[PDB]
Design a protein around this ligand. Structure first.
Ligand SMILES: *[C@@H]1O[C@H](CO)[C@@H](O[C@@H]2O[C@H](CO)[C@@H](O)[C@H](O)[C@H]2NC(C)=O)[C@H](O)[C@H]1NC(C)=O
Ligand SMILES: *[C@@H]1O[C@H](CO)[C@@H](O[C@@H]2O[C@H](CO)[C@@H](O)[C@H](O)[C@H]2NC(C)=O)[C@H](O)[C@H]1NC(C)=O
Ligand SMILES: [Cu+2]
Ligand SMILES: [Cu+2]
Ligand SMILES: [Cu+2]
Length: 496
């Protein structure tokens, strides 16, 4: 409803999305953060004006535009100390990038520490005027964006270091155990109409098993990739994932429960917790009294495929790529590790490091956390789950790319012929060996890490330094970008 050219003023204030008041982060003075939209191929110019004054939730900030490849604008990608130094309070910074060849549902959020959990996170839709699925629905607008999110009554830096959510928010609203009368989100449909709902997890941690009483969901997009349509009666959505699904509002006029059950915290719907309302025009303005029927047709990610049936890059056999990497997870010192190394943010961001003359992964800080990738190649990366990295299933996100999921969680099989592609994947439960493949078509340092934010805070990340020799030439930085670091580094710690 704003964008692709817009100011995003970031500030602190009180919010009560579950009827409990707490300080948090506002964007353009509202919580939850407003929807940004654009069309396929647009240039987004988002001027992030940082007016935050609360050091507990961090005064500085950095925004990631989740899903966008940022080709040639890797400086705009957002992650703090990888792609930029944070914007300092009292200053503003323009993200100016383009979205050639991508359309679908995205989102943005702070990518500094666990700040996004404090409320800096909103959806983004990039519409396709020739969407290949346009004929499947009648309505696709601001009122068909559905966000899911976890909500804590204690700030990120105030509660336990891996806290339990007090409430699931759906479109920024929901109930906790002690605010059972708090207002529910209502999503309205007219009988006979077909809806493209764009579901996006802004979660900092839980995954949600999502369903809508008495309705089927035809899933047609996953993480901004067009799918063959695939009807399900429920879907599990991990932190940072998006699905578009067509809902045919063909049921009787009534209220139906929308259900979003987290894998942790409160795991029932007593008193309308974990819920929002799907209201048909004409139905009473009251809660649903509908009942969950067992899901007998849940989304299975190995059954999803791309609209085009695109093969995985490389050749259809394990290790059939230019470079194959294995990410061995562990945990010690109260830090997550990958291949023995815990990510600590470097003081010089990784992008600046390459621009300043780093030539190799070995040069790049932090040591042991950065992988050099060859240019113009196929890569395979295995992310095998283990009990040594507690809080599994961990959802891993690759910045700057879409990837083929050759092997999904809960499956034993490898599909190279027509696997789903997406950009956030569950790495599943011990015994799984989630395996992804992508092409190195995008020079620059790209974060690969766990989208449980409390985990990335605890080191659960690596940097893919893609095509180092071409990073500087492919990503010319604007002067405002070059100015972020000296300004940041001048801050006293209490102002960070
Ligand atoms: C800055 O943000 C923090 C975190 O939101 C606020 O922390 C609160 O602190 C009070 C009193 O110490 C506690 O009773 C609350 O439980 C905290 N809230 C949260 C969400 O954890 C702090 O109040 C904020 N500062 C200002 C000046 O508003
Ligand atoms: C998960 O998959 C990866 C990728 O196939 C496995 O690592 C390979 O293991 C084979 C057989 O031992 C070796 O030849 C290679 O050295 C490994 N490839 C790479 C890129 O390291 C990994 O061992 C699997 N893990 C589990 C637990 O099944
Ligand atoms: Cu993200
Ligand atoms: Cu994790
Ligand atoms: Cu990230």
């Amino acid at each position: 409803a704003i964008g692709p050219v817009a100011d995003l003023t970031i500030s602190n204030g009180a919010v009560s999305p579950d009827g409990f008041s707490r300080q948090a982060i506002l964007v353009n003075d509202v919580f939850p953060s407003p929807l940004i939209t654009g069309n396929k191929g647009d240039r987004f110019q988002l001027n992030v004006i940082d007016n935050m004054t609360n050091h507990t939730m961090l005064k500085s900030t950095s925004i990631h535009w989740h899903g966008f490849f940022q080709h040639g604008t890797n400086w705009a990608d957002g992650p703090a100390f990888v792609n930029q130094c944070p914007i300092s309070t009292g200053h503003a910074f323009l993200y100016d990038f383009q979205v050639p060849d991508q359309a679908g549902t995205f989102w943005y959020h702070s990518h500094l520490s666990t700040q996004y959990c404090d409320g800096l996170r909103g959806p983004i839709v990039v519409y396709d005027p020739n969407d290949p699925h346009a004929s499947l629905y009648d309505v696709d607008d601001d009122s068909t964006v559905i966000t899911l999110a976890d909500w804590y009554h204690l700030a990120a830096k105030v509660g336990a270091p891996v806290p339990t959510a007090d409430a699931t928010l759906i479109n920024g609203l929901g109930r906790s155990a002690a605010t059972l009368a708090a207002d529910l989100a209502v999503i309205t449909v007219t009988k006979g109409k077909r809806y493209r709902f764009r579901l996006v997890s802004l979660s900092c941690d839980p995954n949600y098993t999502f369903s809508i009483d008495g309705h089927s969901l035809t899933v047609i997009e996953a993480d901004s990739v067009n799918l063959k349509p695939h009807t399900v009666d429920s879907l599990q959505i991990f932190a940072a994932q998006r699905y578009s699904f067509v809902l045919n509002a063909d049921q009787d006029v009534d209220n139906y429960w929308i259900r979003a059950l987290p894998n942790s915290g409160t795991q029932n719907f007593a008193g309308g917790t974990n819920s929002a309302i799907l209201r048909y025009d004409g139905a009473a303005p009251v809660e649903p009294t509908t009942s969950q029927t067992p899901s007998t047709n849940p989304l299975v990610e190995s059954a999803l495929t791309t609209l085009k049936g695109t093969a995985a890059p490389g050749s259809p056999t394990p290790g059939g790529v230019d470079l194959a990497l294995n990410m061995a997870f562990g945990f010690a010192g109260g830090n997550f590790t990958i291949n023995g190394a815990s990510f600590t943010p470097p003081t010089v961001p990784v992008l600046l490091q390459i621009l300043s003359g780093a030539q190799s992964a070995a040069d790049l800080l932090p040591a042991g956390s950065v992988y050099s990738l060859p240019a113009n190649a196929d890569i395979e990366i295995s992310l095998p789950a283990t009990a040594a990295a507690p809080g599994f299933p961990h959802p891993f996100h690759l910045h700057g790319h879409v990837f083929a999921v050759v092997r999904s969680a809960g499956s034993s099989t490898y599909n190279y012929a027509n696997p789903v592609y997406r950009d956030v994947v569950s790495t599943g439960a011990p015994g799984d060996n989630v395996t992804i493949r992508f092409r190195t078509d995008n020079p620059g340092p790209w974060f690969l890490h766990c989208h449980i934010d409390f985990h990335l805070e605890a080191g659960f990340a690596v940097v893919m330094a893609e095509d180092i020799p071409d990073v500087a030439a492919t990503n010319p930085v604007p002067q405002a970008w070059s100015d972020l670091c000296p300004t940041y580094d001048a801050l006293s710690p209490d102002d960070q």
